């Protein structure tokens, strides 16, 4: 019942030992392991912190069967600053980990919902390059 492990190398050089079943939730890592025979797997665009996050997410979702509501654990896991969330989106996309990408993107989406334009601007520090006429115009669908 105990699986073999592979190695992942973050862009800073740190090497992480990960159960192969857990690591292969990443299709990217799966193909670099199986088809390219790279071990440790170079990840020049994922830093150690983000990689730690990704690995603990995958480790947590290790035994997942297969509705749209975000599980509380994932919610708490994503109670992070916007920078981490951003890099988690990038990493989840590059690593091809569909679930993590979905839940993170939906988290950002949830940061947009139920807000006025200016509130969204405050949330994501958006610079307004609309003039009064464009604002009046965008009012219309």
């Amino acid at each position: 019942g105990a699986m073999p492990s592979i190695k992942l190398q973050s862009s800073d050089g740190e090497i992480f030992e990960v159960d192969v079943e857990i690591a292969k939730q990443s299709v990217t890592i799966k193909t670099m392991l199986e088809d390219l025979g790279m071990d440790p797997v170079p990840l020049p665009n994922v830093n150690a912190a983000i990689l730690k996050k990704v690995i603990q997410w995958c480790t947590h979702h290790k035994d997942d069967p297969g509705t749209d509501d975000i599980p509380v654990w994932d919610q708490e896991f994503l109670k992070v600053d916007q920078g981490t969330l951003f890099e988690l989106i990038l990493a989840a996309n590059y690593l091809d980990i569909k679930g993590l990408l979905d839940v993170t993107c939906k988290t950002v989406a949830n940061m947009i919902k139920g807000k006025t334009p200016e509130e969204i601007r405050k949330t994501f520090n958006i610079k307004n390059d609309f003039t009064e006429e464009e604002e009046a115009q965008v009012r219309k669908e």
């Binding site: 193909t31 088809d35 390219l36 170079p42 020049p44 989840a92 996309n93 690593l95 091809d96 990408l101």
Partner: protein, 76 residues
């Protein structure tokens, strides 16, 4: 001139390229650089679970219209 291919760069990201079956893999990587700024020496292209060699051509790997390559990154 004038074949169209796809390079999967992530779960939801892709690069669209216009190529010729006589184009080398290095030409493909070069176009990839021109469109994304990734240096060719950091690019690994994969088709049908096999590494694509810079010297070879799309034809040698039997890559045709609407074929999907996979881009993966390594250290410089």
């Amino acid at each position: 001139g004038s074949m169209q291919i796809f390079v999967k760069t992530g779960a939801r990201t892709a690069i669209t390229l216009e190529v010729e079956p006589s184009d080398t893999i290095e030409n493909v990587k070069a176009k990839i650089q021109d469109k994304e700024g990734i240096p060719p020496d950091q690019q690994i292209l994969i088709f049908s679970r096999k590494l694509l060699e810079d010297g070879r051509t799309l034809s040698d790997y039997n890559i045709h219209r609407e074929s999907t390559l996979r881009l993966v990154l390594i250290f410089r």
